[PDB]
Design a protein around this motif. Structure first.
Motif, PDB file in Angstrom:
ATOM      1  N   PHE B  18      -8.553 -55.992  20.155  1.00  0.00           N
ATOM      2  CA  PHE B  18      -8.704 -57.435  20.308  1.00  0.00           C
ATOM      3  C   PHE B  18      -7.569 -58.172  19.607  1.00  0.00           C
ATOM      4  O   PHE B  18      -7.004 -59.117  20.156  1.00  0.00           O
ATOM      5  CB  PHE B  18     -10.056 -57.903  19.759  1.00  0.00           C
ATOM      6  N   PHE B  19      -7.230 -57.743  18.396  1.00  0.00           N
ATOM      7  CA  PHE B  19      -6.125 -58.358  17.675  1.00  0.00           C
ATOM      8  C   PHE B  19      -4.843 -58.227  18.485  1.00  0.00           C
ATOM      9  O   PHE B  19      -4.106 -59.197  18.662  1.00  0.00           O
ATOM     10  CB  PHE B  19      -5.936 -57.726  16.295  1.00  0.00           C
ATOM     11  N   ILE B  20      -4.586 -57.021  18.978  1.00  0.00           N
ATOM     12  CA  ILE B  20      -3.410 -56.770  19.795  1.00  0.00           C
ATOM     13  C   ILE B  20      -3.412 -57.691  21.004  1.00  0.00           C
ATOM     14  O   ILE B  20      -2.378 -58.240  21.382  1.00  0.00           O
ATOM     15  CB  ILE B  20      -3.369 -55.309  20.284  1.00  0.00           C
ATOM     16  N   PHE B  21      -4.583 -57.868  21.604  1.00  0.00           N
ATOM     17  CA  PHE B  21      -4.686 -58.617  22.848  1.00  0.00           C
ATOM     18  C   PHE B  21      -4.395 -60.103  22.670  1.00  0.00           C
ATOM     19  O   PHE B  21      -3.745 -60.716  23.515  1.00  0.00           O
ATOM     20  CB  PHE B  21      -6.068 -58.443  23.480  1.00  0.00           C
ATOM     21  N   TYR B  22      -4.883 -60.683  21.578  1.00  0.00           N
ATOM     22  CA  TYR B  22      -4.758 -62.123  21.371  1.00  0.00           C
ATOM     23  C   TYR B  22      -3.498 -62.534  20.613  1.00  0.00           C
ATOM     24  O   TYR B  22      -3.014 -63.653  20.779  1.00  0.00           O
ATOM     25  CB  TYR B  22      -5.985 -62.664  20.634  1.00  0.00           C
ATOM     26  N   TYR B  23      -2.964 -61.641  19.786  1.00  0.00           N
ATOM     27  CA  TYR B  23      -1.874 -62.021  18.888  1.00  0.00           C
ATOM     28  C   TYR B  23      -0.541 -61.328  19.185  1.00  0.00           C
ATOM     29  O   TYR B  23       0.468 -61.614  18.542  1.00  0.00           O
ATOM     30  CB  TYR B  23      -2.299 -61.811  17.432  1.00  0.00           C
ATOM     31  N   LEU B  24      -0.538 -60.429  20.163  1.00  0.00           N
ATOM     32  CA  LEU B  24       0.710 -59.876  20.679  1.00  0.00           C
ATOM     33  C   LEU B  24       0.823 -60.243  22.156  1.00  0.00           C
ATOM     34  O   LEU B  24       1.177 -59.417  22.996  1.00  0.00           O
ATOM     35  CB  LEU B  24       0.763 -58.360  20.478  1.00  0.00           C
ATOM     36  N   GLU B  25       0.521 -61.503  22.447  1.00  0.00           N
ATOM     37  CA  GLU B  25       0.427 -62.007  23.813  1.00  0.00           C
ATOM     38  C   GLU B  25       1.672 -61.713  24.649  1.00  0.00           C
ATOM     39  O   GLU B  25       2.798 -61.743  24.147  1.00  0.00           O
ATOM     40  CB  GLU B  25       0.184 -63.518  23.782  1.00  0.00           C
ATOM     41  N   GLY B  26       1.452 -61.439  25.931  1.00  0.00           N
ATOM     42  CA  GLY B  26       2.531 -61.247  26.885  1.00  0.00           C
ATOM     43  C   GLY B  26       3.468 -60.101  26.564  1.00  0.00           C
ATOM     44  O   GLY B  26       4.672 -60.200  26.794  1.00  0.00           O
ATOM     45  N   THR B  27       2.920 -59.007  26.046  1.00  0.00           N
ATOM     46  CA  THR B  27       3.722 -57.834  25.726  1.00  0.00           C
ATOM     47  C   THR B  27       3.119 -56.581  26.344  1.00  0.00           C
ATOM     48  O   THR B  27       1.983 -56.592  26.822  1.00  0.00           O
ATOM     49  CB  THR B  27       3.845 -57.627  24.203  1.00  0.00           C
ATOM     50  N   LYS B  28       3.897 -55.505  26.333  1.00  0.00           N
ATOM     51  CA  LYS B  28       3.460 -54.222  26.865  1.00  0.00           C
ATOM     52  C   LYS B  28       2.237 -53.726  26.102  1.00  0.00           C
ATOM     53  O   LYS B  28       1.302 -53.185  26.691  1.00  0.00           O
ATOM     54  CB  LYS B  28       4.600 -53.203  26.773  1.00  0.00           C
ATOM     55  N   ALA B  29       2.248 -53.929  24.789  1.00  0.00           N
ATOM     56  CA  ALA B  29       1.133 -53.523  23.943  1.00  0.00           C
ATOM     57  C   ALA B  29      -0.161 -54.166  24.426  1.00  0.00           C
ATOM     58  O   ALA B  29      -1.164 -53.483  24.629  1.00  0.00           O
ATOM     59  CB  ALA B  29       1.404 -53.905  22.492  1.00  0.00           C
ATOM     60  N   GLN B  30      -0.126 -55.483  24.612  1.00  0.00           N
ATOM     61  CA  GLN B  30      -1.300 -56.236  25.041  1.00  0.00           C
ATOM     62  C   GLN B  30      -1.884 -55.662  26.325  1.00  0.00           C
ATOM     63  O   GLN B  30      -3.100 -55.579  26.485  1.00  0.00           O
ATOM     64  CB  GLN B  30      -0.934 -57.703  25.268  1.00  0.00           C
ATOM     65  N   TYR B  31      -1.004 -55.271  27.236  1.00  0.00           N
ATOM     66  CA  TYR B  31      -1.416 -54.772  28.538  1.00  0.00           C
ATOM     67  C   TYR B  31      -2.120 -53.427  28.404  1.00  0.00           C
ATOM     68  O   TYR B  31      -3.184 -53.211  28.982  1.00  0.00           O
ATOM     69  CB  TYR B  31      -0.191 -54.648  29.443  1.00  0.00           C
ATOM     70  N   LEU B  32      -1.522 -52.527  27.632  1.00  0.00           N
ATOM     71  CA  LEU B  32      -2.101 -51.210  27.406  1.00  0.00           C
ATOM     72  C   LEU B  32      -3.392 -51.324  26.600  1.00  0.00           C
ATOM     73  O   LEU B  32      -4.302 -50.506  26.747  1.00  0.00           O
ATOM     74  CB  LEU B  32      -1.095 -50.313  26.685  1.00  0.00           C
ATOM     75  N   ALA B  33      -3.465 -52.344  25.750  1.00  0.00           N
ATOM     76  CA  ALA B  33      -4.682 -52.629  25.004  1.00  0.00           C
ATOM     77  C   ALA B  33      -5.782 -53.062  25.968  1.00  0.00           C
ATOM     78  O   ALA B  33      -6.917 -52.586  25.886  1.00  0.00           O
ATOM     79  CB  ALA B  33      -4.426 -53.712  23.972  1.00  0.00           C
ATOM     80  N   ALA B  34      -5.437 -53.969  26.875  1.00  0.00           N
ATOM     81  CA  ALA B  34      -6.369 -54.432  27.892  1.00  0.00           C
ATOM     82  C   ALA B  34      -6.942 -53.234  28.637  1.00  0.00           C
ATOM     83  O   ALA B  34      -8.149 -53.144  28.860  1.00  0.00           O
ATOM     84  CB  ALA B  34      -5.670 -55.370  28.859  1.00  0.00           C
ATOM     85  N   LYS B  35      -6.062 -52.315  29.016  1.00  0.00           N
ATOM     86  CA  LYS B  35      -6.474 -51.098  29.698  1.00  0.00           C
ATOM     87  C   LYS B  35      -7.407 -50.276  28.816  1.00  0.00           C
ATOM     88  O   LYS B  35      -8.448 -49.807  29.272  1.00  0.00           O
ATOM     89  CB  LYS B  35      -5.247 -50.271  30.089  1.00  0.00           C
ATOM     90  N   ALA B  36      -7.032 -50.101  27.554  1.00  0.00           N
ATOM     91  CA  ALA B  36      -7.852 -49.344  26.616  1.00  0.00           C
ATOM     92  C   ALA B  36      -9.276 -49.892  26.566  1.00  0.00           C
ATOM     93  O   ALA B  36     -10.239 -49.131  26.514  1.00  0.00           O
ATOM     94  CB  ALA B  36      -7.225 -49.369  25.228  1.00  0.00           C
TER      95      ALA B  36
END
Lengths: 90, 96
Positions: B18-36
């Motif tokens: 969730f932290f990755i998703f909201y605070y690393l917005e618009g990045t590859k990390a966020q996307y893979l986090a969403a998938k996770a």
């Protein structure tokens, strides 16, 4: 802010600390952890926290039991009879 | 594991994701986090812009919506909360 990182789980602080280097976020995570009584071993490169009261404490080191977060295994572990030399302290 | 794969964010805790998703917005990390999060049966409600998870089997299911009880991560309080008798409209869903 400083209080936010206070809320975050420890595992989240560790992720921030190890994977977002040279960033504000890391900086506040480091402090958030310190306030939770975690200390950084500048050699092993891992965060430690007294599990219980140490056996021995001198001016240069302490020994006892600790839990630590091993970033290689990404998991909290435990060490008995460990010597934390203060020269490896920040 | 390699930071650029989904197998990597799979090792992280939900709150971290969730932290990755909201605070690393618009990045590859966020996307893979969403998938996770999606393997864990979390789904993103695009209006509320929060993640939901079925707490139990929904009461009603149609083609346009489902209804029942969910847990959700409120990012304003930054905490897991719960909703009963909630209608999750499928139009506010990422991928049907």
């Amino acid at each position: 802010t400083v209080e936010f990182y206070q809320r975050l789980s420890t595992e989240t602080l560790f992720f921030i600390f190890y994977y977002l280097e040279g960033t504000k976020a890391q900086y506040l995570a480091a402090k958030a952890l310190k306030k939770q009584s975690w200390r950084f071993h500048t050699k092993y490169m891992m965060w430690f926290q007294r599990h219980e009261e140490p056996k021995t404490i001198t001016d240069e080191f302490e020994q006892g039991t600790y839990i630590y977060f091993d970033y290689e295994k990404w998991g909290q572990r435990k060490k008995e009879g460990f010597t934390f030399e203060y020269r490896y302290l920040e």
